[PDB]
Design a protein around this ligand. Sequence first.
Ligand SMILES: Nc1ncnc2c1ncn2[C@@H]1O[C@H](COP(=O)(O)OP(=O)(O)OC[C@H]2OC([n+]3cccc(C(=O)O)c3)[C@H](O)[C@@H]2O)[C@@H](O)[C@H]1O
Ligand SMILES: Nc1ncnc2c1ncn2[C@@H]1O[C@H](COP(=O)(O)OP(=O)(O)OC[C@H]2O[C@@H]([n+]3cccc(C(=O)O)c3)[C@H](O)[C@@H]2O)[C@@H](O)[C@H]1O
Ligand SMILES: Nc1ncnc2c1ncn2[C@@H]1O[C@H](COP(=O)(O)OP(=O)(O)OP(=O)(O)O)[C@@H](O)[C@H]1O
Ligand SMILES: Nc1ncnc2c1ncn2[C@@H]1O[C@H](COP(=O)(O)OP(=O)(O)OP(=O)(O)O)[C@@H](O)[C@H]1O
Ligand SMILES: [Mg+2]
Ligand SMILES: [Mg+2]
Lengths: 255, 262
Amino acid sequence: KDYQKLIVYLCDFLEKEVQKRGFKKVVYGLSGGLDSAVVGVLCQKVFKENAHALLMPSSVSMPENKTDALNLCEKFSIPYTEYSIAPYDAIFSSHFKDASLTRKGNFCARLRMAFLYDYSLKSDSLVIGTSNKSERMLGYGTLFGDLACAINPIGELFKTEVYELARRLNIPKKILNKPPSADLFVGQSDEKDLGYPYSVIDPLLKDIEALFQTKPIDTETLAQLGYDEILVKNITSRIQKNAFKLELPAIAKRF
Amino acid sequence: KDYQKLIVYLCDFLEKEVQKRGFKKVVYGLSGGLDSAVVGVLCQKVFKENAHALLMPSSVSMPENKTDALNLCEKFSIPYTEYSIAPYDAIFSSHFKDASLTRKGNFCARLRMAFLYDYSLKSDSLVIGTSNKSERMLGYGTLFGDLACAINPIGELFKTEVYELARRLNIPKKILNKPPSADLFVGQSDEKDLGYPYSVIDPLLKDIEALFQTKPIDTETLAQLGYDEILVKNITSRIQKNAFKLELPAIAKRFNPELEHH
Ligand SMILES: Nc1ncnc2c1ncn2[C@@H]1O[C@H](COP(=O)(O)OP(=O)(O)OC[C@H]2OC([n+]3cccc(C(=O)O)c3)[C@H](O)[C@@H]2O)[C@@H](O)[C@H]1O
Ligand SMILES: Nc1ncnc2c1ncn2[C@@H]1O[C@H](COP(=O)(O)OP(=O)(O)OC[C@H]2O[C@@H]([n+]3cccc(C(=O)O)c3)[C@H](O)[C@@H]2O)[C@@H](O)[C@H]1O
Ligand SMILES: Nc1ncnc2c1ncn2[C@@H]1O[C@H](COP(=O)(O)OP(=O)(O)OP(=O)(O)O)[C@@H](O)[C@H]1O
Ligand SMILES: Nc1ncnc2c1ncn2[C@@H]1O[C@H](COP(=O)(O)OP(=O)(O)OP(=O)(O)O)[C@@H](O)[C@H]1O
Ligand SMILES: [Mg+2]
Ligand SMILES: [Mg+2]
């Protein structure tokens, strides 16, 4: 129950990493969801007015999410800026009508990466990421999109742990009770895309991280732990298919 | 010859890296410049028609560059597609009229990454990078922009070496002698931005690679070699300031509390 210890640890991390790089200001995307709310509150405790939230709704971003984001900023005195990327996704939709929801969402996530980095350069700030360990392991995120940042304080925290941390940070119940959703298209949700809730995925991901962090996953070993055959096959496939997102691009060694 | 061994080496790298990932098709951005022309020719030899070139001119892109890129595809039978990003940068210019040239250029480089990746997903392909070793060490490129890719065959070749390889690959003279330029704004050139041509930069980078790799750069040692003080200061700064572009993000490790009995 020593989450106060964890909060101090993460705040110290943010302070040290930003300082060692020669910066004193940070920016991050605030979506109205749990993860970015946690990152926003942590940065506010460390940089106060020097931590800035950037809200970037799209043409399909759900309205409620944005208002919840604004309410968070007012509650925690977080300076913010609202910048719509709708004019950009509108062009993409007109040029690629039959584009899959995934392609449309990935473009938006990258547009967000671009404006966060643009904002950072013009204001001399660093971009703080919000991807949690569950998403990172599953590769549930857009490469060079929401996975793009300079520093990420909750990258080794599983989704269930980010939630527990959020409670200690007094994150609004509105955001705490909100089901995870990339919000890249109307009706999207982590549970629907993944097929299982984080209450079922996280326990398995934790054993996989402990047993096979730098070695191949042994589905038979996981089977012995009492995990559903189908569940293991599905989660293992996702992890192995997206392992590349956690690695640097392959560069031919000097001849 | 060693250049032929190099070509075979790079071709094998591309085929093995793409195959081990379960792919058979690749895509890359063709700007009309030397770096992308080199990557395009190499990919054509390995994947033939399965290697696609994506031309993405902006509102400021020089027209001559697109023409040279198109002629390259014709000479080497490279399938291509032209998608202008002008409509997108036009909105950016309208929203941020006073944005710096660097900010505007970074936005375009990132739009190109997004379309290359969009194209790769819809066609079951991998994005091949074109950043050379000089650009990588100097951080002369947009993070998550042109530096973004799955595999990069020329990341360990200095610009000067890329030029020599290009000669053996029979790249059009128009491209070979073309001055390096991000072409993110009218009149841009690597020499004007960096302050020096690669003929002066590369020799210094090669010494830095040989002298410093386990320890930080020592400007006094470089001064003893005979390098000009300004060149050393300029290049050393670019390398140290932009080293972060070649690394993954800093992620906070799991918290391990120091227990009372520890
Ligand atoms: N083996 C390999 N080695 C190196 N590169 C490889 C590769 N295999 C594919 N690639 C490349 O990776 C690309 C596919 O990766 P990527 O573009 O990320 O795309 P993808 O993984 O296909 O889509 C991202 C997914 O996670 C999503 N997401 C996005 C944003 C936020 C959240 C959230 O929960 O907040 C979730 C999204 O909705 C979708 O379900 C390919 O098209 C290809 O260019
Ligand atoms: N220490 C650090 N650790 C982690 N992240 C750090 C950081 N310092 C800055 N950052 C972040 O990195 C950002 C700055 O990097 P970045 O956005 O790339 O921007 P930046 O390096 O400032 O501009 C890109 C540069 O490379 C150029 N370029 C671009 C595109 C193509 C070519 C070409 O030759 O084709 C050359 C360009 O002309 C310019 O000289 C910052 O705003 C910040 O968010
Ligand atoms: N409309 C948006 N405005 C600003 N940032 C956004 C927006 N949509 C996505 N982002 C950014 O991309 C990330 C993707 O959201 P993600 O679903 O992963 O987490 P979240 O919304 O913070 O929390 P949760 O996973 O519970 O929904 C956000 O954390 C945020 O940094
Ligand atoms: N108009 C464009 N169309 C397609 N791709 C582009 C365009 N502009 C830039 N790119 C991509 O981004 C990269 C920019 O890198 P860069 O300008 O340094 O190299 P280059 O133009 O190939 O060669 P050079 O360094 O001599 O200019 C290109 O290699 C290419 O993949
Ligand atoms: Mg969300
Ligand atoms: Mg060029």
